[PDB]
Enzyme design. Structure first.
Site, PDB file in Angstrom:
ATOM      1  N   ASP A   1       0.845  -1.184   0.000  1.00  0.00           N
ATOM      2  CA  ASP A   1       0.000   0.000   0.000  1.00  0.00           C
ATOM      3  C   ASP A   1       0.890   1.248   0.000  1.00  0.00           C
ATOM      4  O   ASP A   1       2.090   1.184   0.275  1.00  0.00           O
ATOM      5  CB  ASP A   1      -0.942  -0.063   1.214  1.00  0.00           C
ATOM      6  CG  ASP A   1      -1.677   1.245   1.505  1.00  0.00           C
ATOM      7  OD1 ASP A   1      -1.612   2.202   0.710  1.00  0.00           O
ATOM      8  OD2 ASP A   1      -2.341   1.309   2.561  1.00  0.00           O
TER       9      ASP A   1
HETATM   10  C1  LIG Z   1       1.912  12.812  17.410  1.00  0.00           C
HETATM   11  C2  LIG Z   1       1.563  14.011  16.530  1.00  0.00           C
HETATM   12  C3  LIG Z   1       0.051  14.234  16.290  1.00  0.00           C
HETATM   13  C4  LIG Z   1      -0.685  13.049  15.606  1.00  0.00           C
HETATM   14  C5  LIG Z   1      -2.226  13.205  15.419  1.00  0.00           C
HETATM   15  C6  LIG Z   1      -2.783  13.027  13.964  1.00  0.00           C
HETATM   16  C7  LIG Z   1      -4.072  12.136  13.822  1.00  0.00           C
HETATM   17  C8  LIG Z   1      -4.236  11.326  12.485  1.00  0.00           C
HETATM   18  C9  LIG Z   1      -5.306  10.188  12.471  1.00  0.00           C
HETATM   19  C10 LIG Z   1      -6.544  10.481  11.567  1.00  0.00           C
HETATM   20  C11 LIG Z   1      -7.147   9.286  10.778  1.00  0.00           C
HETATM   21  C12 LIG Z   1      -7.031   9.338   9.245  1.00  0.00           C
HETATM   22  O1  LIG Z   1      -6.414   8.504   8.639  1.00  0.00           O
HETATM   23  S1  LIG Z   1      -7.869  10.686   8.299  1.00  0.00           S
HETATM   24  C13 LIG Z   1      -8.986   9.987   6.949  1.00  0.00           C
HETATM   25  C14 LIG Z   1      -8.677  10.533   5.532  1.00  0.00           C
HETATM   26  N1  LIG Z   1      -9.426   9.897   4.433  1.00  0.00           N
HETATM   27  C15 LIG Z   1      -9.195   8.606   3.951  1.00  0.00           C
HETATM   28  O2  LIG Z   1      -8.299   7.939   4.470  1.00  0.00           O
HETATM   29  C16 LIG Z   1     -10.049   8.066   2.802  1.00  0.00           C
HETATM   30  C17 LIG Z   1      -9.328   7.115   1.815  1.00  0.00           C
HETATM   31  N2  LIG Z   1      -7.953   6.823   2.235  1.00  0.00           N
HETATM   32  C18 LIG Z   1      -6.838   7.074   1.411  1.00  0.00           C
HETATM   33  O3  LIG Z   1      -7.078   7.558   0.311  1.00  0.00           O
HETATM   34  C19 LIG Z   1      -5.389   6.760   1.886  1.00  0.00           C
HETATM   35  O4  LIG Z   1      -4.606   7.424   0.954  1.00  0.00           O
HETATM   36  C20 LIG Z   1      -5.006   5.255   1.838  1.00  0.00           C
HETATM   37  C21 LIG Z   1      -6.013   4.459   1.009  1.00  0.00           C
HETATM   38  C22 LIG Z   1      -4.959   4.750   3.271  1.00  0.00           C
HETATM   39  C23 LIG Z   1      -3.560   5.052   1.170  1.00  0.00           C
HETATM   40  O5  LIG Z   1      -3.630   5.310  -0.127  1.00  0.00           O
HETATM   41  P1  LIG Z   1      -2.378   4.678  -1.304  1.00  0.00           P
HETATM   42  O6  LIG Z   1      -2.920   3.289  -1.505  1.00  0.00           O
HETATM   43  O7  LIG Z   1      -2.540   5.654  -2.446  1.00  0.00           O
HETATM   44  O8  LIG Z   1      -1.102   4.802  -0.502  1.00  0.00           O
END
Ligand SMILES: CCCCCCCCCCCC(=O)SCCNC(=O)CCNC(=O)[C@H](O)C(C)(C)COP(=O)(O)O
Ligand SMILES: CCCCCCCCCCCCCCCCCC(=O)OC[C@H](COP(=O)([O-])OCC(O)COP(=O)([O-])OC[C@@H](COC(=O)CCCCCCCCCCCCCCCCC)OC(=O)CCCCCCCCCCCCCCCCC)OC(=O)CCCCCCCCCCCCCCCCC
Ligand SMILES: CCCCCCCCCCCCCCCCCC(=O)OC[C@H](COP(=O)([O-])OCC(O)COP(=O)([O-])OC[C@@H](COC(=O)CCCCCCCCCCCCCCCCC)OC(=O)CCCCCCCCCCCCCCCCC)OC(=O)CCCCCCCCCCCCCCCCC
Ligand SMILES: CCCCCCCCCCCCCCCCC[C@@H](O)O[C@H](CO[C@H](O)CCCCCCCCCCCCCCC)COP(=O)(O)OCC[N+](C)(C)C
Ligand SMILES: CCCCCCCCCCCCCCCCC[C@@H](O)O[C@H](CO[C@H](O)CCCCCCCCCCCCCCC)COP(=O)(O)OCC[N+](C)(C)C
Ligand SMILES: CCCCCCCC/C=C\CCCCCCCC(=O)O[C@H](COC(=O)CCCCCCC/C=C/CCCCCCCC)COP(=O)(O)OCCN
Lengths: 459, 70, 88, 107, 56, 40, 178
Positions: C43
């Site tokens: 991924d």
């Molecule tokens: C310690 C410092 C602070 C930390 C706090 C930060 C908190 C972050 C946690 C929030 C949760 C989330 O993921 S926020 C949610 C954002 N939206 C989505 O994840 C929808 C679809 N996902 C994608 O498109 C991704 O890219 C993916 C398929 C995984 C890879 O893609 P590839 O296949 O192109 O690599």
């Protein structure tokens, strides 16, 4: 005094009877010899003066200015040799003639036992400078600059003439010795107030005073390198010399009348030092620095104490040398980049290391690093002002801080950082430019060994 | 290890030439001056203060101590 | 400094070392030209983790814009060689 | 609009010429190598050698026309005299009061 | 070569000549300010047996 | 690289009948090159 | 650095950049490697639970709360690689970088030393002179009308061609010239 005046006059037929390709060599050699001869005026007395004749006299205030004037001409010729290459022999001879005439008028002005003769020569210096600015300047603003440099001056100088003749109609003489020996107090009257103003404003405009300084940035920016050198080094000091001479008849009215000019200078030094921090042009920054230094000299002359006068003399000499060096460095950059914009050519230390050393030493002397004569004059004036009033220390220290800030800002912007990529015409520094820089800077560090030569008649 | 690389840098020829010229001329005049000054101090010496003899008026240059100043 | 003048062979070996120490990839099927997305089924989160591992193992940072389009060990090695100016 | 957009007959702006191009060892004085070399030599000899060194030595050894040592010796003998006689060193009056005639007020 | 470099270097002699002429003129102007020579209260001096003027 | 010199537009400032043109004096015309007017 | 930027960042690129930034800042917080590995696996898990969301509005409401949380807990003194734009040796060796054209100003006595280098330099200059004339035409014919839309350059198409505008990329001074 004729043993200096006659050779300077003979510089003209020698220039006009020279070969087409020997004018610079002959002019430089004989101007250097005239400087060496004039160097023997420094043997001054603890008593009155060197009264050569009824027309000319020398003083330990006049002698350093005379020597600096004679020393400036060879440097001006060396600086002018480059950008006048593509020009006809007659026009180059005319340019050298203008420089020689300026030197002759300045030499006769600084001795000038008569006040009317002093005024005549002090205004005769106007013509060569105006011709140099409006003939051999580059931009289209030069004409406008010339107009300013003209009318401001005359706007101050025409009343003075009236005052001068008025004095001779009452006193009976305008000889400086007779004036000094027969001086009398000025009563607090409206007529005396206006006589004071007519005597002061002409020299105030050419320092220049803070409110009356508009002509200086234009005139210094649009002038060629020799014009800028002579404007900053010698022509600005005519006002200080005239004030130092003329304040002998203005007592005790100076005590009251000095306040507006003292406030103008003390606030304008801060204003112009702050202006230097935000400047997109090197020449304009150097011009505003000159305005700040001359504001300090104005304060010194207005306080009229022995330490004030010594500091003012030292600062005038040191500023002349330092500002001429700074203008020469800026012009060396300009003749390569043709822009005169400070932010354009960057990181020149990596390409011109010796020129970077020259930049550093010039910034250090402008910054008034001890034991330079710049700091000697600065400190003497500051101590005199502190005795005058303890609150001047805030303004003086703020001016020192801002001066260091803008000097190092100028050094860091042009010499440090990364070189500009698209500029590929930065050629190695010529021997002429390095020799010019050394001939500016060694006299300063060598004068710090014998300060009494430039501390004036009250030492 | 024969991994010596070329160092790109500006020409130092002109700066060295100017420094050599300035040093040469300053020394050309200053070395004879230094030697002469030392020689004058060593053999000529310096004048010693003395009372003016009666009936004798000194020259203007006889009121100074160093021989070069005199 | 005294840092050895690293070569292409060292960069390739070290990149493959870091990749074989990633246990989501079987080392025997790993090759220099193997694609991350299709030849190994990783991924994009795995790809950015691999970029972080390369950064931490070579001591310098690959910017996001350049890192997000590095999909083979060979082109990772090429990027590192171009950044560090390796001769052979 | 058959105008040429050429407002007048003008020479093109020439490009700056490098003195190092036609002559290395150019010293930046003139495009003629001989005049260039002699200009460098005269500037260096009459600026650094003659004025800067000999003039500095001349200024260093200028005779005491300011009378610094003279004033020091005068003060030394004057202080020796007044200390010996018990006089109060410097007097507060610059001129003798007997020879000044003040104006009587009679207020 | 003599009579050839003179026609090319004649101009050089002028500045030095001016310096000498100025010195001569300064002395000549000095000769017109002797109204108080050996007459000032500070330097009233009795002339030496083989002296004409105290200073020239 | 080259010193500025007046162009045609700079010169045309000084070509009018008078300097500092006004609405009333706009309709003025410079005199003929030779000081002769057509007899009409 | 090398790659030309786009007009915008897509949602996936934003999520991946947030992932990298959060992991680096968590490493700054979690100094030790075992603690960092544990918390980084937890962090990856917390990203993965919304990997399959189909609603773009939902996914955009996410990543926003996430970047707000990141800005709240972002370790105001994160670890920076020494050569990175915030590092302690970022532009240390820029003062040693001299342009290649400066060698044209060397004195002939200076070029007498290193003759092979300057012969190869002359060869390179000739190659540049010819390749430039080819490159201008190739770029003029390949650029779309109205000007370029993206600052990406094409490669060479023919046998003897060189990539357009190659001289100042090939002749970089060095990463550490001295
Ligand atoms: C310690 C410092 C602070 C930390 C706090 C930060 C908190 C972050 C946690 C929030 C949760 C989330 O993921 S926020 C949610 C954002 N939206 C989505 O994840 C929808 C679809 N996902 C994608 O498109 C991704 O890219 C993916 C398929 C995984 C890879 O893609 P590839 O296949 O192109 O690599
Ligand atoms: C400290 C004691 C020194 C004793 C040794 C004698 C030194 C004599 C020097 C005379 C003046 C130098 C001439 C100026 C131009 C420089 C020429 C040049 O280009 O160098 C080429 C040459 C060859 O180098 P390169 O590789 O070819 O060039 C590569 C680049 O140029 C890159 O070159 P770079 O990176 O090496 O930089 C060049 C260097 C040189 O460039 C400069 O910046 C020099 C000018 C600095 C002064 C700035 C003005 C401020 C006012 C100070 C006035 C002091 C003058 C005193 C009287 C001097 C008489 C003339 O600049 C510096 O290194 C920065 C130094 C900062 C010093 C600031 C401290 C000032 C006050 C110190 C005390 C003074 C009073 C003491 C009182 C109590 C004790 C008795 O380099 C040198 O030889 C270096 C010059 C010597 C360093 C000077 C530092 C201290 C000297 C102060 C003046 C004399 C002190 C007298 C007291 C003695 C006891
Ligand atoms: C196994 C062993 C067996 C043998 C054992 C026996 C032998 C060996 C052991 C025994 C001997 C031990 C050592 C004995 C020492 C004395 C012996 C001796 O020979 O005494 C002779 C003699 C004896 O003295 P005296 O006659 O009894 O005393 C009368 C007074 O000295 C009259 O005063 P004055 O007016 O003549 O003074 C002039 C003054 C200054 O001279 C000037 O004013 C010249 C002015 C020229 C200004 C312009 C210069 C040119 C432009 C430069 C531009 C640069 C860019 O000269 C000095 O400055 C000397 C400085 C001495 C310093 C001593 C240490 C001081 C340290 C203080 C600070 C300490 C903490 C740090 O003294 C001298 O010869 C002094 C020579 C000074 C030479 C100055 C040169 C100036 C050059 C100007 C142009 C420079 C251009 C650059 C190149 C210059 C050339 C490098
Ligand atoms: C490159 C690395 C360094 C190599 C070189 C190493 C050597 C360094 C030594 C030189 C600098 C160190 C400072 C030590 C100074 C020693 C000499 C000094 O003591 O002499 C001075 C003497 O020099 C003069 O005072 C200063 C020179 C005057 C400068 C005139 C300028 C030259 C004209 C140029 C044109 C003018 C342009 C500016 C117009 C105002 C002061 O002496 P002073 O105690 O006092 O009396 C002289 C002797 N008496 C007692 C017999 C009377
Ligand atoms: C613009 C850039 C700088 C240019 C130069 C600026 C410097 C010029 C400043 C002039 C110096 C002071 C001028 C007058 C000083 C006199 C003292 C006066 O200010 O105090 C009061 C004076 O009172 C009033 O000022 C009376 C005059 C009122 C009219 C003056 C106009 C006020 C503003 C004008 C300023 C414009 C300056 C520029 C003109 C073009 C005290 O009243 P009094 O004790 O009873 O009389 C004292 C005078 N005596 C003794 C001779 C009789
Ligand atoms: C940078 C531009 C500045 C322009 C000039 C600024 C200086 C202005 C100074 C005044 C100008 C003329 C003054 C006269 C010259 C001195 C002569 C004198 O002192 O004689 C006075 C004469 O005094 C006057 O006549 C002064 C009249 C001034 C008229 C012109 C006014 C100009 C503007 C006034 C306001 C601004 C004043 C200061 C401006 C400073 C510059 C900004 C007394 O003589 P009597 O009258 O014969 O004897 C008394 C018994 N009857």
């Amino acid at each position: 005094m004729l043993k200096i005046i006659i050779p300077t006059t003979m510089l003209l037929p020698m220039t006009w009877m020279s070969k087409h390709n020997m004018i610079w060599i002959n002019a430089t050699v004989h101007s250097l010899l005239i400087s060496l001869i004039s160097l023997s005026l420094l043997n001054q007395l603890g008593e009155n003066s060197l009264n050569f004749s009824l027309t000319f006299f020398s003083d330990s205030l006049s002698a350093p200015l005379l020597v600096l004037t004679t020393w400036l001409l060879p440097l001006m010729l060396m600086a002018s040799q480059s950008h006048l290459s593509k020009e006809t022999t007659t026009r180059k001879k005319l340019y050298i003639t203008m420089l020689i005439l300026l030197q002759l008028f300045l030499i006769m002005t600084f001795t000038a036992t008569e006040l009317i003769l002093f005024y005549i020569l002090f205004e005769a210096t106007l013509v060569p400078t105006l011709i140099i600015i409006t003939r051999w300047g580059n931009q289209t603003e030069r004409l406008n600059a010339g107009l300013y440099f003209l009318f401001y001056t005359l706007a101050g100088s025409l009343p003075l003439l009236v005052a001068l003749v008025y004095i001779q109609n009452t006193t009976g003489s305008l000889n400086f010795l007779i004036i000094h020996y027969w001086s009398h107090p000025l009563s607090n009257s409206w007529s005396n107030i206006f006589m004071w103003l007519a005597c002061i404003m002409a020299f105030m405009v050419k320092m220049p005073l803070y409110g009356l300084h508009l002509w200086l940035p234009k005139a210094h920016v649009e002038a060629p390198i020799a014009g800028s050198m002579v404007l900053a080094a010698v022509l600005l000091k005519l006002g200080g010399y005239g004030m130092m001479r003329i304040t002998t008849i203005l007592n005790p009215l100076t005590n009251y009348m000095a306040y507006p000019f003292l406030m103008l200078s003390m606030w304008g030094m801060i204003m112009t030092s702050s202006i230097c921090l935000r400047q997109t042009d090197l020449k304009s920054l150097i011009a505003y620095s000159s305005v700040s230094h001359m504001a300090l000299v104005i304060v010194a002359i207005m306080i009229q104490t022995p330490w004030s006068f010594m500091g003012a003399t030292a600062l005038m000499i040191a500023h002349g040398l330092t500002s001429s060096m700074l203008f020469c460095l800026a012009n060396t950059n300009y003749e390569r980049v043709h822009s005169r914009t400070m932010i354009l050519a960057r990181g020149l230390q990596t390409l011109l290391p010796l020129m970077a050393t020259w930049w550093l030493v010039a910034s250090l002397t402008n910054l008034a690093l001890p034991p330079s004569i710049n700091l000697i004059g600065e400190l003497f004036i500051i101590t005199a002002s502190f005795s005058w009033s303890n609150i001047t220390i805030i303004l003086m220290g703020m001016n020192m801080m801002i001066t260091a800030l803008y000097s190092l800002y100028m050094l860091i912007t042009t010499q440090r950082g990364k070189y500009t990529h698209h500029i590929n015409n930065i050629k190695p520094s010529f021997t002429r430019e390095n020799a010019l820089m050394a001939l500016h800077i060694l006299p300063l560090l060598l004068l710090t060994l014998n300060p009494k030569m430039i501390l004036g008649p009250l030492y | 290890h024969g991994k010596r690389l070329f160092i790109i840098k500006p020409s130092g020829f002109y700066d060295r030439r100017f420094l050599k010229l300035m040093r040469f001329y300053i020394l050309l005049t200053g070395i004879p001056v230094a030697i002469g000054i030392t020689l004058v101090n060593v053999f000529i010496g310096e004048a010693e203060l003395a009372d003016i003899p009666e009936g004798y008026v000194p020259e203007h240059w006889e009121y100074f101590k160093h021989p070069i100043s005199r | 400094s005294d840092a050895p003048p690293l070569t292409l062979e060292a960069i390739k070996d070290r990149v493959l070392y870091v990749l074989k120490l990633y246990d989501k990839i079987d080392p025997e099927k790993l090759s220099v030209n193997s694609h991350f997305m299709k030849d190994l089924g990783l991924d994009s989160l795995d790809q950015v983790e691999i970029i972080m591992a390369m950064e931490d193992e070579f001591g310098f940072e690959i910017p996001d814009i350049d890192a997000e389009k590095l999909m083979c060990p060979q082109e990772i090695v090429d990027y590192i060689a171009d950044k560090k100016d390796v001769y052979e | 609009p058959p105008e040429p957009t050429i407002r007048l007959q003008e020479d093109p702006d020439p490009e700056d010429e490098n003195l190092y191009e036609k002559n290395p060892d150019s010293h930046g004085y003139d495009k003629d190598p001989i005049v260039d070399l002699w200009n460098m030599r005269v500037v260096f000899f009459f600026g650094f050698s003659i004025v800067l060194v000999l003039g500095s030595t001349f200024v260093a050894y200028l005779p005491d026309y300011r009378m610094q040592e003279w004033a020091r010796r005068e003060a030394e003998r004057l202080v020796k005299y007044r200390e010996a006689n018990g006089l109060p060193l410097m007097e507060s009056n610059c001129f003798d009061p007997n020879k000044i005639q003040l104006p009587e007020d009679e207020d | 070569n003599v009579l050839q470099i003179v026609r090319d270097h004649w101009v050089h002699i002028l500045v030095p000549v001016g310096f000498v002429f100025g010195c001569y003129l300064d002395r000549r102007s000095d000769e017109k300010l002797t109204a108080f020579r050996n007459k000032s209260l500070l330097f009233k001096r009795e002339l030496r047996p083989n002296e004409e003027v105290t200073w020239k | 690289a080259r010193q500025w010199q007046p162009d045609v537009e700079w010169a045309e400032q000084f070509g009018g009948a008078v300097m500092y043109p006004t609405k009333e004096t706009a309709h003025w015309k410079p005199p003929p090159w030779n000081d002769v007017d057509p007899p009409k | 650095a090398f790659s030309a930027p786009a007009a915008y960042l897509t949602h996936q690129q934003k999520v991946l950049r947030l992932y990298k930034r959060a992991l680096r800042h968590l490493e700054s917080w979690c100094v030790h490697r075992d603690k960092y590995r544990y918390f980084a696996c937890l962090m990856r898990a917390r990203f993965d639970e919304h990997k399959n969301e189909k609603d773009m509005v939902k996914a955009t409401q996410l990543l926003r709360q996430a970047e707000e949380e990141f800005w709240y807990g972002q370790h105001p003194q994160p670890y920076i690689f020494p050569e990175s734009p915030g590092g302690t040796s970022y532009e240390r060796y820029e003062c040693y970088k001299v342009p290649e054209w400066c060698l044209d100003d060397w004195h002939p006595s200076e070029k007498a030393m290193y003759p092979d280098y300057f012969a190869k330099r002359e060869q390179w200059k000739r190659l540049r002179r010819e390749s430039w004339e080819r490159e201008v035409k190739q770029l003029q014919e390949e650029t779309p009308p109205g000007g370029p839309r993206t600052e990406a350059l094409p490669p060479a198409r023919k046998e003897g061609d060189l990539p357009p505008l190659w001289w100042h990329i090939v002749t970089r001074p060095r990463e550490r010239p001295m």
